[PDB]
């Protein structure tokens, strides 16, 4: 579910998930199309490809089981949907953290009409 995703983002990046990441560049959140802007936008791309692949699981609503024990996020659900959604959410949150060193505040609320250029096959 998205609030679990939100928590993971917080722990890794220390930024507020909705105001930092929901409207970032071309491919964060509801980000339809356009060439990715930077490593962060790309983190967001791969996470969409992650979620679409799990469409049946309803990844935005589906609560799973995870813990941040000893530096790492461990995905502790047994069943596939919950097993894999968590993996996606982790995969992104750690992606953001290691790409903070180029987090660009002028992409935070990016005007997406500037995200022109043919779409990216998942």
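Q: What amino acid sequence fits the structure above?
A:
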């Amino acid at each position: 579910s998205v609030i679990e995703f939100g928590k993971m983002i917080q722990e890794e990046t220390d930024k507020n998930p909705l105001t930092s990441y929901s409207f970032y560049g071309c491919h964060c959140g509801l980000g339809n199309g356009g060439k990715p802007k930077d490593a962060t936008d790309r983190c967001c791309f791969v996470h969409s490809c992650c979620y679409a692949s799990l469409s049946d699981c309803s990844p935005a609503t589906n609560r799973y089981s995870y813990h941040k024990e000893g530096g790492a996020i461990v995905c502790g659900s047994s069943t596939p949907c919950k097993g894999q959604i968590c993996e996606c959410d982790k995969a992104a949150a750690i992606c953001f953290k290691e790409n903070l060193k180029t987090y660009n505040k002028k992409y935070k609320v990016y005007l997406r009409f500037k995200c022109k250029g043919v779409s990216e096959k998942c």
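Q: And what stands out in the fold?
A: Residues 1-122 form a domain with the Phospholipase A2 fold (CATH 1.20.90.10).
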